[PDB]
Amino acid sequence: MTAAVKDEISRLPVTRTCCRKAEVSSILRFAGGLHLVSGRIVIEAELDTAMAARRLKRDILEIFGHSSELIVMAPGGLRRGSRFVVRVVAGGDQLARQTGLVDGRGRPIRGLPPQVVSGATCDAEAAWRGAFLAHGSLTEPGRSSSLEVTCPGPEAALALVGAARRLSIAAKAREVRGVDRVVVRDGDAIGALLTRLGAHESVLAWEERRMRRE
């Protein structure tokens, strides 16, 4: 359902440096976290996609200059979902401070880094791409996909809504059962958004499926 979509997004080549930085920051913020162990900060990011973890590791090594481990052992323990976990221990504090998770010698930033916000539209769509790669789903249970992506806390969700607005694409933040996400319902916005992210074959398949079924 979404495996092909995320594969296509991961396989998309990227050139501009700022967009790569924004994508890395988004994925780290959404599907990543920090742990203060043995007196040092270690960054752990959990992905459930084959190529996405490699892409994130390569981006870190290239732009931020750091090394990762890329372990395949499942934190869930099932070992069937291939819950990849990429780790950064050497220079973890520097990576955290220079990627936007923590700034001002203070608490972790709830929303997306200020650098990602108030940037070019390319960086906004790159941040949305990273958010979709990290977490999200494409359900199509009934009449609409419900292209929902969950976020930690209202701040990240509303920041994603704001970023989507800059693309002239409708979006809506929602909260249920204490967990909040951003969703877009109408088919036209879904198609335009998926086209902008870079996926092509999945966009077509969805287009014909919707037109034939509806």
Next chain:
DNA sequence: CCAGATCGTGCGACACACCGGGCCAATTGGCCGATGCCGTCCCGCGAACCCCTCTACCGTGTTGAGCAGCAGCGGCCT
């Protein structure tokens, strides 16, 4: 041995899923229209600001070294 955990199954509740209705709260944000103080400018005079002019006892002076060209001189040549 055999009894609760796990799960099957069942009944109900039920938190909303819908996608569609029918009105509303908050909250407007424009400048509408009316009233009022400040920027610009046009003198008005006056302080200063710069230039020009004139004063008639009279009075009359400021190292060493290397290389090259020119002036004076001894001495033929006519």
